[PDB]
Design a protein around this ligand. Structure first.
Ligand SMILES: CCCCCCCCCCCCCCCCCC(=O)OC[C@H](COP(=O)([O-])OCC[N+](C)(C)C)OC(=O)CCCCCCCCCCCCCCCCC
Ligand SMILES: CC(C)CCC[C@@H](C)[C@H]1CC[C@H]2[C@@H]3CC=C4C[C@@H](OC(=O)CCC(=O)O)CC[C@]4(C)[C@H]3CC[C@]12C
Ligand SMILES: CC(C)CCC[C@@H](C)[C@H]1CC[C@H]2[C@@H]3CC=C4C[C@@H](OC(=O)CCC(=O)O)CC[C@]4(C)[C@H]3CC[C@]12C
Ligand SMILES: CC(C)CCC[C@@H](C)[C@H]1CC[C@H]2[C@@H]3CC=C4C[C@@H](OC(=O)CCC(=O)O)CC[C@]4(C)[C@H]3CC[C@]12C
Ligand SMILES: CCCCCCCCCCCCO[C@@H]1O[C@H](CO)[C@@H](O[C@H]2O[C@H](CO)[C@@H](O)[C@H](O)[C@H]2O)[C@H](O)[C@H]1O
Ligand SMILES: [Mg+2]
Length: 1030
């Protein structure tokens, strides 16, 4: 449901709004960016819908869209136009103007469109372009840079500049600025590549009333224009409905299948024209017309029906354009409320110490930047940068590195078929010759077969020309002659190495009679021989019955039910003398008469060699593999059973749904197929009917379904979204233009193609196999584990520095500029860059990393680590007090004036080691990363930083001038501090190990989580309790 709000404008109100939002402060514009309803309520007054210059579109969800006039008032909401009909006073989508008109209307539209009516319809429907708006750099900056965390980083930088902390301020500013500029460049480049992708400019021929034909640009098309399709064929600019002639279309855009499709003229009648009902008379936008024949009339005619975003390609692009981290933000919000508490406490104690109010507020605001680290997102992006580099080395190109963390949460991967799991093109399984009238065993490689009539039939009965020093034409005959091993020289042929034979005459292949025939002769022969190739079934009806076996039909169905593409061949001895002086005057009706079936050649879409190992690895690690294809259900089911998606022992149950006509409801029919546990194999129409009429039974279909065939691109997108609504993390591997909406909607969409799909997909694989799915899943599990470790380290670092600065505020001192800089830059940047370094484990496991940063393991680790940290720091500070040589810190003046002092020296000496200890403690190895001892840069960095800090503590006068450290002469106390921090080094590792090993078992033993909150897990449980299809 949609609600519209009519808001006209008032100039005095406009200037008032501008001044009150600009001169007062920048906060109002920001909060209105958060909620535009208040902004549009204050800025513009409510008016009637007949005078509105602004709309508030609610879906609630707030969008605002300005009503534009050309008169005809319209607005564009998510690409789809809505015009203003003055008569009935409403905004009607343009798709619904001519919706529901009869086939006789489309046929009447065959004469053309008057140029004035073309102007009216170009005003209404707009130009026939799929326009992507490429925003300018300020337009992207106001969208991105105003991120709440970039605002917090700007506040932190301003405060640090106000606090003489210029160096870390500069580092954070440079990091955030370069990250922002890189993201703006990436976003603009993606928008530009998409706009270059969907762009289609070409000259088309349109009929005009009175018999005139004019060539207009493809953008000047409007629903009603009568396209005149070229005979040689070309790309399709707009959804048209054939009103004359026939076409052969390459619909690999819609179906992902390069197989030619026959489109016939729309049948005249008084029935509503429908893209779904009349799909065989509709030419879709983006699909390539191979050839168009005009039997009656001078040229083939098509009547435009949808243009722009109304087309199928337009709908897919509109879906593309207009579709842990949450726990991370929740934890930084908890850190923020802890910041508020610590800040009010700091105000209290700093006022107790007679600190001036300016420095009081400076310190109290600086504690906020202390405990809420402004360098957390960069620290957590370093690991994804490492993973992106490793993927680029392996051939997989990720455009947004933070999308790699989603590869580690995957519970389900949806797979294309043609081009992703199976080879792009057909390959010949073999040929089955005939000896008399009984079939012979399948000959897998036709070349070994002796030199007889059927072999020359395979090698010569085809229409392909020699150009670019390569045979070119229809792929099936190409691959068949490639298998026979013969090299071609009407036209002459040479054997592999067995006499050269030349074809004398050839007849064209027409899809009406659905076969082609040639006549051939060679020297030393008796008389010219004819060859016939085409459909398997009908040519058997042409040959004599005593030549075709009686078991022809059942064998043909056994081949076809497996997804094969069978073609039959026959020959003829011609009593005419061997010379083309009489051979090319022959009528082919004589050829297809009295035929004798030689044999059937079978071609099947081979599976890639790298498909079955990857599918069995995914199914071994408890990752669901789904096949969402655009091919028929028989081929999809055969490939699924053959690529390991359906193991030989598992049950496949076809789901069939009949759309309810008048007088009956909708039905589901389950028929099993003989050779989790049950897989459901349902078509595209069945999926649509289950979505619409059976929304109760859709979750069980999505949980059990494995094979989704005949799926339209919008249906693949809908399936990915419906699976994600079951709280799946859906990955999608495809290589076609039909896979684009799914690769965009999927959590991890991987594209094997370099055209039309690398744009929308986050990942693009340079290889053609699905070997890139386990690679991305391993890198994603590694990046997720590493981002967990880096977040735990940054949390423990911020909390340790919070405690160290509270202990020093309480006694009227502080860490100081250079100790702060050491801790913030030298230790923390080194640690957070070299933690994120170690790569993924070499093998996939059945258990995936946790996806919640608020887990009881994570929070328990942070709590106990910080208890140990504050214990060690307070122990060191209080043993400092019990010493005889200890003297107070001259509280009358505040830091950095009273530095150096023993309190600061001891707190810094302990805290500096604690940062390295926590760094090493939170880092993990198996099962998702390589063991930590392989991270030799990290271990060497920890050793070197620990050596520097031990030199600070022990070696006198070493870096105690710059860092402002008091020199402790008592060697016993220095050794006691070192023993205390070694106690901490042992305790941190023992705590981490004990937690990781015991807390899962203890949590299982104390509070058994008998119910999973994931929706698909509840569905799986209730299905195991009671199977849905009996
Ligand atoms: C001085 C900085 C010079 C090197 C910056 C490299 C920028 C880069 O390639 O990253 C882009 C990426 C793109 O991220 P995105 O969010 O724009 O996508 O973002 C970064 O710049 C991350 C910076 C990593 C360094 C953080 C270290 C701080 C640790 C505490
Ligand atoms: C405030 C300032 C001082 C911080 C500066 C930090 C940078 C020096 C860090 C942040 C991102 C890091 C980069 C993150 C990603 C990588 C990829 C890495 O290469 C690989 O991973 C290839 C491995 C394979 O393919 O097998 C080389 C290091 C590098 C560039 C890192 C180099 C050091 C960088 C530039
Ligand atoms: C005077 C003090 C306060 C500052 C001294 C200069 C710092 C800016 C230096 C000292 C330690 C340097 C760090 C030493 C260690 C590393 C790891 C290095 O990463 C790699 O080695 C990439 C190779 C891989 O990961 O395989 C990137 C630079 C970095 C963060 C350096 C960043 C710049 C640092 C922080
Ligand atoms: C005076 C200075 C030189 C003090 C040096 C202190 C060392 C004793 C510390 C620094 C970091 C510590 C290392 C930090 C972490 C690791 C990884 C750890 O590996 C595992 O536990 C297995 C898990 C996996 O598979 O990764 C082995 C110990 C080790 C090398 C520690 C051994 C002792 C080290 C080298
Ligand atoms: C992990 C430990 C890292 C220690 C690295 C710190 C090294 C700092 C050296 C730069 C010194 C700057 O120069 C020093 O500035 C401080 C305060 O700014 C002055 O005080 C000193 O007189 C001057 O020598
Ligand atoms: Mg495909």
């Amino acid at each position: 449901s949609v609600r519209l709000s009519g808001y006209c404008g008032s100039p005095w109100r406009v200037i008032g709004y501008h001044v009150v939002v600009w001169m007062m402060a920048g906060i109002p514009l920001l909060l209105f960016r958060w909620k535009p309803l208040w902004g549009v309520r204050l800025r513009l007054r409510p008016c009637n819908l007949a005078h509105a210059e602004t709309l508030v579109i609610e879906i609630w969800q707030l969008f605002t869209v300005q009503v534009q006039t050309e008169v005809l008032r319209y607005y564009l909401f998510q690409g789809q136009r809505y015009i203003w009909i003055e008569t009935q006073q409403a905004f009607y989508q343009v798709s619904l103007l001519d919706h529901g008109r009869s086939c006789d209307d489309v046929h009447r539209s065959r004469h053309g469109l008057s140029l004035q009516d073309q102007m009216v319809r170009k005003a209404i429907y707009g130009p026939n372009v799929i326009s992507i708006p490429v925003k300018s750099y300020p337009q992207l900056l106001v969208d991105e840079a105003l991120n709440p965390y970039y605002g917090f980083q700007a506040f932190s930088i301003a405060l640090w500049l106000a606090d003489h902390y210029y160096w870390y301020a500069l580092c954070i500013f440079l990091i955030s600025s370069i990250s922002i500029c890189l993201s703006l460049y990436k976003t603009r480049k993606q928008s530009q590549t998409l706009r270059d992708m969907v762009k289609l400019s070409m000259r088309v021929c349109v009929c005009r009333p009175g018999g005139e034909e004019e060539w207009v640009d493809s953008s000047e098309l409007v629903p009603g224009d009568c396209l005149v399709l070229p005979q040689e064929g070309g790309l399709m600019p707009c959804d048209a409905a054939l009103v004359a002639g026939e076409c052969m279309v390459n619909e690999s855009s819609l179906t992902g299948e390069s197989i030619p499709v026959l489109k016939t003229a729309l049948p005249e009648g008084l029935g509503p024209y429908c893209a779904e009902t009349h799909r065989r008379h509709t030419l879709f936008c983006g699909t390539l017309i191979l050839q168009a024949r005009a039997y009656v009339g001078p040229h083939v005619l098509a009547v435009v029906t949808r243009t722009g975003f109304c087309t199928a390609k337009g709908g897919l692009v509109s879906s593309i354009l207009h579709p842990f981290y949450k726990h991370s933000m929740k934890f930084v919000a908890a850190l923020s409320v802890l910041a508020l508490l610590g800040t009010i406490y700091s105000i209290f104690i700093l006022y107790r110490n007679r600190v001036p109010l300016n420095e009081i507020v400076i310190r109290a605001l600086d504690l906020v930047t202390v405990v809420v680290p402004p360098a957390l997102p960069a620290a957590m992006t370093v690991c994804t940068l490492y993973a992106q580099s490793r993927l680029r080395r392996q051939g997989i190109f990720c455009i947004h590195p933070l999308r790699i963390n989603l590869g580690g949460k995957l519970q389900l991967v949806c797979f294309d078929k043609t081009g992703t799991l199976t080879e792009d093109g057909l390959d010949v399984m073999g040929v089955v010759p005939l000896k008399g009238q009984a079939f012979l065993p399948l000959v897998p490689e036709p070349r070994r077969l002796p030199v007889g009539p059927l072999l020359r039939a395979l090698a010569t009965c085809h229409a392909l020309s020699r150009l670019q020093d390569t045979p070119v034409g229809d792929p099936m005959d190409l691959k068949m002659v490639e298998s026979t091993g013969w090299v071609l020289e009407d036209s002459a042929f040479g054997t592999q190495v067995p006499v050269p034979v030349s074809v004398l005459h050839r007849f064209p292949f027409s899809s009406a009679l659905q076969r082609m025939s040639v006549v051939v002769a060679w020297p030393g022969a008796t008389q010219p021989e004819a060859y016939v190739k085409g459909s398997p079934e009908l040519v058997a009806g042409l040959c004599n019955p005593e030549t075709v076996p009686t078991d022809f039909a059942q064998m043909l169905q056994s081949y076809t039910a497996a997804g094969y593409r069978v073609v039959a061949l026959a020959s003829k001895p011609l009593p005419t003398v061997p010379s083309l002086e009489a051979a090319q005057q022959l009528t082919r009706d004589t050829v297809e008469g009295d035929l004798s079936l030689l044999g059937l050649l079978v071609m099947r879409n081979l599976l890639k060699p790298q498909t079955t190992p990857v599918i069995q690895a995914l199914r071994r690690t408890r990752i669901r593999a789904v096949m969402v294809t655009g091919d028929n259900l028989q081929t999809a089911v055969t490939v699924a059973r053959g690529c390991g998606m359906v193991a030989p022992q598992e049950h496949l149950i076809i789901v069939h749904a009949t759309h309810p006509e008048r007088g009956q409801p909708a039905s589901l029919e389950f028929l099993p197929m003989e050779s989790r546990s049950r897989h459901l194999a349902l078509s595209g129409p069945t999926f649509g009917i289950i979505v619409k009429h059976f929304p109760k039974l859709l979750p069980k279909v999505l949980v059990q379904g494995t094979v989704f065939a005949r799926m339209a691109p919008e249906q693949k997108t809908e399936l990915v979204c419906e699976l994600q609504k079951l709280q799946y993390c859906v990955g999608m591997c495809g290589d076609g233009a039909n896979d684009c909406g799914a690769l965009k909607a999927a959590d991890v969409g991987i594209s094997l193609s370099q055209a039309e799909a690398s744009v929308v997909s986050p990942f693009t694989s340079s290889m053609a196999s699905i070997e890139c799915v386990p690679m991305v899943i391993r890198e994603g599990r590694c990046s997720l584990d590493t981002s967990f470790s880096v977040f735990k380290y940054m949390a423990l670092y911020s909390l340790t520095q919070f405690i160290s600065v509270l202990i020093l505020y309480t006694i009227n001192t502080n860490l100081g500029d250079l100790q702060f800089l050491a801790i913030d830059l030298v230790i923390t940047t080194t640690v957070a860059v070299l933690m994120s370094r170690t790569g993924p484990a070499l093998v996939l496991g059945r258990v995936r990393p946790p996806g919640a940063l608020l887990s009881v393991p994570v929070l328990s680790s942070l709590l106990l680590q910080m208890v140990l940290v504050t214990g060690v720091q307070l122990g060191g500070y209080f043993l400092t007090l019990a010493q005889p040589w200890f003297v107070p810190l001259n509280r009358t003046v505040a830091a950095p004036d009273n530095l150096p002092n023993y309190e600061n020296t001891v707190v810094f000496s302990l805290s500096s080691f604690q940062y390295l200890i926590l760094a090493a403690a939170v880092s993990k190895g198996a099962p998702f990363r390589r063991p930590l001892y392989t991270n030799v840069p990290f271990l060497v960095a920890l050793a070197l930083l620990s050596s520097v800090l031990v030199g600070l503590v022990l070696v006198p006068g070493l870096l105690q001038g710059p860092l402002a450290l008091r020199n402790i002469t008592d060697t016993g106390f220095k050794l006691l501090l070192l023993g205390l921090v070694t106690l901490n080094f042992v305790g941190a590792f023992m705590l981490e190990s004990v937690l990781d090993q015991c807390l899962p078992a203890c949590l299982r033993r104390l509070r058994p989580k008998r119910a999973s909150k994931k929706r698909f897990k509840q569905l799986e449980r209730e299905l195991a309790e009671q199977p849905w299809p009996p």
